[PDB]
Amino acid sequence: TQSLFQPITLGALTLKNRIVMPPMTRSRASQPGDVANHMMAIYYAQRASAGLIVSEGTQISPTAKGYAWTPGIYTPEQIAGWRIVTEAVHAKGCAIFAQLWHVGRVTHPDNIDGQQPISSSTLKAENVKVFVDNGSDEPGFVDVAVPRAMTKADIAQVIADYRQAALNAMEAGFDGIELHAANGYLINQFIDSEANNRSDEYGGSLENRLRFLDEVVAALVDAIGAERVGVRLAPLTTLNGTVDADPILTYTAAAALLNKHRIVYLHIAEVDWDDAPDTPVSFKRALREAYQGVLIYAGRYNAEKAEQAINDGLADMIGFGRPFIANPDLPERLRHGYPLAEHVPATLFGGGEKGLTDYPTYQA
Numbered sequence: 001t002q003s004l005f006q007p008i009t010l011g012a013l014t015l016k017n018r019i020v021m022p023p024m025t026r027s028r029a030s031q032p033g034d035v036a037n038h039m040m041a042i043y044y045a046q047r048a049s050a051g052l053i054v055s056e057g058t059q060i061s062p063t064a065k066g067y068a069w070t071p072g073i074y075t076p077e078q079i080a081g082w083r084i085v086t087e088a089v090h091a092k093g094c095a096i097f098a099q100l101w102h103v104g105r106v107t108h109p110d111n112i113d114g115q116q117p118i119s120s121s122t123l124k125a126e127n128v129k130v131f132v133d134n135g136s137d138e139p140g141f142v143d144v145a146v147p148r149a150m151t152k153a154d155i156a157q158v159i160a161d162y163r164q165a166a167l168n169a170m171e172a173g174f175d176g177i178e179l180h181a182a183n184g185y186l187i188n189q190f191i192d193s194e195a196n197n198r199s200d201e202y203g204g205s206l207e208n209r210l211r212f213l214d215e216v217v218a219a220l221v222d223a224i225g226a227e228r229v230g231v232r233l234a235p236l237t238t239l240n241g242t243v244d245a246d247p248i249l250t251y252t253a254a255a256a257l258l259n260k261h262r263i264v265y266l267h268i269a270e271v272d273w274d275d276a277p278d279t280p281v282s283f284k285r286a287l288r289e290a291y292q293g294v295l296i297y298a299g300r301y302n303a304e305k306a307e308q309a310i311n312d313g314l315a316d317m318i319g320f321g322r323p324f325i326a327n328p329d330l331p332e333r334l335r336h337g338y339p340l341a342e343h344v345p346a347t348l349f350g351g352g353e354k355g356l357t358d359y360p361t362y363q364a
Ligand SMILES: Cc1cc2nc3c(=O)[nH]c(=O)nc-3n(C[C@H](O)[C@H](O)[C@H](O)COP(=O)(O)O)c2cc1C
Pocket: 022, 023, 024, 025, 026, 055, 056, 057, 099, 180, 182, 183, 232, 269, 270, 271, 272, 273, 298, 299, 300, 301, 319, 320, 321, 322, 323, 348, 349
């Protein structure tokens, strides 16, 4: 676990270790207004021994939301709410990036003011569910709705929303932003061939399928600087409905495209819940060559596997998701080999402090 506890430079930041708390939706935002709050600030501060914390997905607009009670980052109140979180995290000496989110077709009208979801095309995500607020504090799971294909105007609007969300994140005190272009959400809906049936310049060819990602990133970098922009991709998982015919070519190309933008880090979501596809070392090495910045991987890693990935030159940082939910002092436990508490699925989403800030630190 030696390399895991080595510091690392991320743009203008000098992080304490290679451990990342990956973005994890907890749906604890205050109502009404979907505002980041006090318990969330405590929650993130409790886990500030991580080298880097990436916030749970935060929607860039009212129609970018896919799940009940997730925090937004477009209203003044929402910005202020996030400010309390970043202040709390910074007081602990940690860095934190805001994950800018647009779920595209992975949502239900109930979560976006009755509006129809948008996507690259009119394809509904197959076998996918999200959850909504149904007059009770227990997530109500529902099938996603059929989306409408984005028009040129929609594309301009979403890019504008992303750009402003980035500025909003800086106003909120975040050290940077992470573009959620993974796990089957909006941008991923353009990237993957089987989810994109557009006949215009945003579909039909690899270059075209990567165009939206290219333009969104261009706007983000222009707004806050490449050193403060990270991007998350999911080349092989397909849990939320996005499948690409030639992932290796598509995502190696995506990595090269992002390298041109000099984004500060590329984050690969290697596992999504129980979707843990074989991710060839050869593929990981190709990504390492296509993208020369900081490479982060998350998905079923333990101390041994994380150390191995870094020592083999495949990754620079490793994110631990589920373990960080239940172990606020995960880094210390990983370093000492202390047993890890396990999280309770029933309290991952919704509710209050229980299952959020009451997982204790290790005590022999
Ligand atoms: C409660 C929960 C919510 C999640 N929500 C998000 C999210 O908001 N954004 C994202 O990119 N990944 C999301 N993830 C995926 C994680 O960031 C991570 O990639 C995944 O859990 C695999 O890592 P693990 O096996 O160490 O948990 C979520 C996972 C958990 C456990």
